[PDB]
Amino acid sequence: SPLAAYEVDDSTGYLTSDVGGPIQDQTSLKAGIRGPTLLEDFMFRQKIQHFDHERVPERAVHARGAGAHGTFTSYADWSNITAASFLNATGKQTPVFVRFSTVAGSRGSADTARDVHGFATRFYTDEGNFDIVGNNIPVFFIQDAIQFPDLIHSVKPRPDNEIPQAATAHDSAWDFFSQQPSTMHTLFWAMSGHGIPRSYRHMDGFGVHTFRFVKDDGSSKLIKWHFKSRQGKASLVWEEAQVLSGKNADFHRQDLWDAIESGNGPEWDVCVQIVDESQAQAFGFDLLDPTKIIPEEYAPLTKLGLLKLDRNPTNYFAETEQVMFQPGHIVRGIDFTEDPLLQGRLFSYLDTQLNRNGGPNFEQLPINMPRVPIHNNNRDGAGQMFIHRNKYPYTPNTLNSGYPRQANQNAGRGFFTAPGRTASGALVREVSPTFNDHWSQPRLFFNSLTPVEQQFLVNAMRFEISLVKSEEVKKNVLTQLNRVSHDVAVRVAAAIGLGAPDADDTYYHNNKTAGVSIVGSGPLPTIKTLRVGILATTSESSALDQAAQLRTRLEKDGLVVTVVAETLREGVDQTYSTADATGFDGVVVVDGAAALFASTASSPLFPTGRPLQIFVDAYRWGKPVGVCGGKSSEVLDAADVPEDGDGVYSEESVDMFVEEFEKGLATFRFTDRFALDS
Amino acid sequence: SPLAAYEVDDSTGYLTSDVGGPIQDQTSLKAGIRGPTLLEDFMFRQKIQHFDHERVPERAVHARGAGAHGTFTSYADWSNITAASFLNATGKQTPVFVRFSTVAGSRGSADTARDVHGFATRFYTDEGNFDIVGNNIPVFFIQDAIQFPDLIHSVKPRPDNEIPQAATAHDSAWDFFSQQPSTMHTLFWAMSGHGIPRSYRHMDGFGVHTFRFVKDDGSSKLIKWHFKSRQGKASLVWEEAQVLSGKNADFHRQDLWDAIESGNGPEWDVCVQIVDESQAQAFGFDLLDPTKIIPEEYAPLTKLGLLKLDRNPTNYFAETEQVMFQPGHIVRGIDFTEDPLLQGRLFSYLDTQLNRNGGPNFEQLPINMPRVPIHNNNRDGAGQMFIHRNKYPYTPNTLNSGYPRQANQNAGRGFFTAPGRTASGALVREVSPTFNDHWSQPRLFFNSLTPVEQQFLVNAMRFEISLVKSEEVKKNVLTQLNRVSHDVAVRVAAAIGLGAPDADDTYYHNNKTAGVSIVGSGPLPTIKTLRVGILATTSESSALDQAAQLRTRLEKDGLVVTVVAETLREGVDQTYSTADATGFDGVVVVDGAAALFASTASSPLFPTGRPLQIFVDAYRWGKPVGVCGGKSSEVLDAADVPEDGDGVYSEESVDMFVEEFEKGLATFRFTDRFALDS
Amino acid sequence: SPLAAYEVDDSTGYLTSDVGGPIQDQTSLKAGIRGPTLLEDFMFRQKIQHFDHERVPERAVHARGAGAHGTFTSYADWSNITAASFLNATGKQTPVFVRFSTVAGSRGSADTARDVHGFATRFYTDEGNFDIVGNNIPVFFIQDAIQFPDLIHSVKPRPDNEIPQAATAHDSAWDFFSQQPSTMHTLFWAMSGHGIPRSYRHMDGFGVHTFRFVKDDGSSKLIKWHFKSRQGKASLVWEEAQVLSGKNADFHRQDLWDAIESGNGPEWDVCVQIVDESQAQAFGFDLLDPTKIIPEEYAPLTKLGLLKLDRNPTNYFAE
Ligand code: HDD
Ligand code: HDD
Ligand code: HDD
Ligand SMILES: [Ca+2]
Ligand SMILES: [Ca+2]
Ligand SMILES: [Ca+2]
Ligand SMILES: [Ca+2]
């Protein structure tokens, strides 16, 4: 913790200026008790000036996000495939910092927007900082970095009025998607449940690009990075995400914070797919193309180590806001590929930190510093924090005895470009013909989802495209969807009253791939941290008694339990007024409370119908719901919830109720409650 | 070093990026050996981006300057006059940093321009950083801060062509001086020897403004700060300064550096004049007026302690360039007065550091940090280096137990405004009538100079005004000068071919004041560090033996000896090609070298006449010169220098030569060699 | 020109703020005639804030310099060798701006330091701005851009004391030159009279690098840019340059200003050496190597047009 050396404690002591002079900061200096404020009030000005300059530009993308500290532990000595020092011994531990994010919204936008999500991991290795700046979706919208402002301008708010915030549901985005068909693969992922994850802990991370692992002998293999969640994969449903955006814009950052504080810090297996250089085009697409995945059937995952997040930042601004990641932060044993999206990224991340930091010495901020000595001839610049002793900062020199020395493949453990890499041909601004198949892999992805997942994706597209005003853009969108799947274009067209174009089967096929479905990936492996809302009443002393007994039983198994009542008191966490179904992964009514759910309910302490609305919403959104007490039928009738439904629980016995209700939590969503196209 | 904790050592090790990855930095990554450079070359881009951003804006004024670390030691417990902690005990020591500067020139301009000089001192006290931002002249050009950009625009280069650099010798400067008569006092100081000091070590420092000392009981006294040089006062002559500006633009910074490295670190007595609040108008002028001195006859200096500079910086940029002084850096026991120049300065220095530093956390740069803990609720901002633990940074609070506490007169040793201070009357943009005598003190100053000093001042005015093209500006200048002294206006007028206006005696008097004269302040109190050039030859093994014997005898008394000859070899420091009279305080020819001084002397190794020119220039500029060995008449006749002249030495004996010559160095300048008007 | 539309005239009128409100700027607002200055004095603070923020970072190299406006006139239709629009017809005129400079000194350093000199020309062409950022010496010290901070750190002042200003006469410079032998060619030029020119008008300019002329059909030829002074070539002597540095630090900018004002605006012939792609290695060195000239005996100069500088800037900072 270079973070702990820079920590500042203010738990005792008298207020000082920034130069250590004790002062006051509550009243301005004035000429007389009702007089004007004086220019000589240095206390006033130092304080306001600091306030007035507190903000810094938000990131150009991924502005909305949150971070945590942890550790990476290697499972083996990986010398045989990479020279990377953080992977060179069983059990070797490296500190990490991770930031998760959306792409499109500004700071302050809602966590539960539909979007691609960032998953950026810094490894503070003993041979330098290494960053993997990935996303929760393994493919990207575009095939060349020069198009990135085009993609981003199209998805961000229309620039006359700056509407809409954090959403692709507008003409410009679908105009771009429909004119730039490379977008189809990422679009399909973003329109699935991968666009609205349950939490940062319930998504995967991917490096997206093919990279190289380079051995000390100089041989190389091609790799893709996969961070596979140990919490399982899980999504919201859209109608739930929308309400969550309003009720709790901070949902994902709160979830992450709380999991870490409770001792449930999330984990991922850090994995690679590893293939030979000769396989760059063996799989029916080009490994230089970031719109393509390698099916796991062609290349299995190898598990390199464990990533665990287990500590929250001390100061959000200083750590999370100021962390400045770069794919250029590379270490010996890793190399780039000629992926034209990766290639341009290298430029952008060094440049953009000048905007954020306002000066060139951004690598000296505590969160950006390495954990090894720095020896170089970089000097001066605004905000220079070091006092360099070497007064001959040039190479070659004799007056500093030739130091710092050059590092390279054979000296000082230098980074070196993989020596088998070559280039040949004309200097061109031309797209490789090997990149031209934009529709096959979207179809592979779509084929690999379950029927209800396919319906959710169609429904997401129906939602967004129905909000596009241009009839031409809508037609063009159907044209592109039709090339992936005639069925998708037909079902989407039905919602927007246009006809789909005739089937064009060039890229149609029936193939599937493992591991891309959320709903298909079986029950969650753990239910720790999941949220249960127990709906109770201060009316009946039996209701708070039953709530307390359920609480014990659920908290035993690591669930986070919230007892809801009309008013706060001992045992009650939340009022009906502040409660919502978006707040819980499952809801239980204690039978003691059945009168609150009648249609003539009414209280000055919460909005009309709130108790029942929580229960109904939770049911309609596919959550496990139940009534505990043995007079269940009255609440279930008021809800129009069938007692015999999957994921509906009714028991008098607390112990039997809990046992089945917990199986429901693992199932997580009951997908039989959602209507499917015929 | 106080700043040891921020030092970075590069005396060993391999080159790394700023994030600790070992790299190389000598060849670009290319596609083929004769190929184009690749964008993925992160080694290139990080290195060049840093270089591309090395520069920061130069200070708006005082851009050209140099600094050093040292110590202040109090002579006493000054409780009786101030609560200031750094003055509260005999022998109490406080680290300091001082920067000296010119005013008008940009950061690569010559040290030996004619100008006002800056003398800015930071005291890193145990109750906060205290800065005295002074000049080497005790009065300022203007009476209101709002006029500062007018003054500075007028003296800086003309904004169409940015000519001339670091000089007042142009129409705009003299236009402003003639139209704004407040300028007269400082103008006379600037045109005296005080405009072209021999070194930073041979000038005084002044706070200029009246300030207040405040006791812990709340009573106050008015003070002026005086830093009185223990090295004595000394000036260049103009014709010398001009040549030095070209031969060694770094003259003052080099002199300071060298004095420190040789163990001759310069010293000042830190003094105050102290008077009662009741005396603010008792001396015939207003103590709020920064164009006035308090004659020493009315208020003597109290010596408070010793300022010694004895350590050079390690990195100029990080220390000297980045030091950000403010008169707002004040400590308990000191307060401001209603001097309208001081009042506006308090705003400027906080604001201008945003420009220099490019962000609001400039007090976190090592040179600017205090040497005591910081406890405040200032947060965020670009370049934030701290990780603040207190997550409730507001007052008033209970969630951080009311910390940090408010400090004031009665708790926590807070700063407090002197409680006797009041204000009365209309809110006005009007000048006090008490400020209106612009001419009496300029006349007091002029009257207090010796006849030769008066001549030099006149000659500085004749030089500068003769370069003003506008006949009307020149007439306007003589109108103002004439109000100070009819004689001055007459003598100046004679050079520029105008008639002086008739005498106007309203502000004429015959009064004098002690201690403002340089010439009249007797011989220097020490000659340590003064420079002696010995002009020798490799022709004659005799000449180099004489030079070696002289050198040993002069070095024993701490003079810096340079032996000069046609070519370097053992015992010879400099060639005639690189030598100039501007490089010496005294010049000695060894008589074995007499042949070099003939008119038909000529060599491919130095410009024609160079040896003799050094001697002649030294004589004409008032320096002690001599011939050592017994045979003096050929050199002295070649140079047209009378053997019986004051400050001309001829002896055979090295011991007798040096005993006489050292008296000459202490005299420093022989003023009988300069012609007087009339 | 675009320069005229942005010009602001202050030869009449009352003082205003930046937002057009008439104001005064000579006395601070105070609580009584001998009182403290008020925070509500917006006239004071807008003025001093602007002053406080006047400066910008100097250029990392070529900080010390001066500029003038002028015209370039093509001598012919150069279609046969380049598609460049500004060279596509006899008599075609294109506005230019040129800045001349030293390399090593800060703002405020003397014009007559010994140094390589900058000669940077912007052509505001009808198909976009085209800059030739050249020097008065045709070859450069180093063969790879990555080394540029090394060269510059070595020649700039020693970083503990920032001594010496605008000068290669110190250990670090000569350490670098002696350890990096690519430097020798430029070093010889800088140690000649080319290091201390008499004026900006009495030096030539060079693009240094080999560039390509490309025709509309896509064929290319290798070129070197030479701007050849019509005023002739002239130098100071060193002992004169040293005194001049002290007596008149603005010597070259004054000389340029004065020549233009007197109707003696300086001229250059803008020239190229033009060789085939196949001759990249034909002359006993590599045309990709910026430490090498092509001897005029092997490739003669072709005169493309006339560069004339004939108007001084209105505002130095802004232009
Ligand atoms: C050419 C530009 C460009 C391209 C093609 C990309 N990005 Fe990027 N990305 C940026 C330019 C950029 C940026 C503007 O440079 C950002 C904003 C702030 C920053 O540090 O970098 C950024 C931020 C950024 C962040 C946030 C890092 C953090 O939490 O601070 C993530 C996770 C990604 N990007 C991930 C990706 C992935 C997985 C991409 C494709 C595979 C991708 N970006 C393509
Ligand atoms: C209203 C503006 C204003 C006024 C009236 C003054 N100054 Fe000032 N001064 C500045 C505005 C300023 C500044 C723009 O704020 C500078 C530039 C850099 C900095 O830190 O402050 C500055 C710098 C500065 C420095 C350089 C400090 C260093 O070495 O970094 C000195 C020594 C002084 N000044 C001294 C004075 C004296 C003795 C004054 C009158 C008694 C004076 N200044 C009036
Ligand atoms: C990799 C960095 C690098 C390299 C190898 C060079 N320069 Fe450069 N040059 C810069 C980096 C730079 C810079 C840091 O980018 C400057 C500073 C100000 C600016 O606009 O660019 C610059 C300024 C600059 C200027 C001043 C322009 C003006 O008047 O505003 C000239 C004339 C040159 N350079 C000319 C050259 C020549 C003829 C070079 C070799 C043939 C050369 N430079 C190599
Ligand atoms: Ca739109
Ligand atoms: Ca900025
Ligand atoms: Ca002028
Ligand atoms: Ca050096």
Numbering used by the authors:
A (entry chain B), B (entry chain C): 21 to 698
C (entry chain A): 21 to 339
Quote the paper.
Catalases (hydrogen-peroxide:hydrogen-peroxide oxido­reductases; EC 1.11.1.6) are redox enzymes that are responsible for the dismutation of hydrogen peroxide into water and molecular oxygen. The structures reveal a homotetrameric enzyme in which each of the four active sites consists of a pentacoordinated iron protoporphyrin IX prosthetic group with a tyrosin­ate axial ligand. The heme is deeply buried inside the protein, with a complex network of channels providing access to the exterior. We have previously shown that in addition to catalase activity, the catalase from S. thermophilum (CATPO) possesses a promiscuous phenolic oxidase activity in the absence of hydrogen peroxide.
The mediation of the 3TR–CATPO interaction by water molecules in the plane of the inhibitor suggests a flexible binding site with the possibility of accommodating a variety of planar ligands of different sizes, suggesting that this could also be the site of phenolic substrate binding. The residues Pro158, His246, Gln293, Ile313, Ile314, Glu316, Leu321 and Val536 surround the 3TR binding pocket and are structurally homologous to the residues that bind NADPH in the mammalian catalases. However, the 3TR binding site for reversible inhibition has not been identified to date, although its noncompetitive nature would be consistent with a non-heme-centred mode of action. We therefore wondered whether this reversible inhibition could in fact be mediated via the oxidase substrate-binding site that we have identified. In this case, we would predict that catechol binding would protect the CATPO catalase activity against 3TR inhibition. We therefore carried out a competition assay at a constant concentration of 3TR (40 mM) that is sufficient to nearly totally inhibit the catalase activity and increasing amounts of catechol, and observed that the presence of catechol reduces 3TR inhibition in a dose-dependent manner. Interestingly, catechol itself inhibits the catalase activity, but in a much less potent fashion than 3TR. This suggests that, as proposed by others, the reversible inhibition by 3TR is mediated via an allosteric effect and that other molecules binding to this pocket will also have an inhibitory action. In this context it is interesting to note that the 3TR complex also shows a reduction in the number of ordered water molecules in the main channel when compared with the apo wild-type structure. In summary, based on our structural, mutation and kinetic data we propose that the pocket at the entrance to the lateral channel, occupied by the nicotinamide moiety of NADPH in mammalian catalases, is the site of both oxidase substrate and 3TR binding.
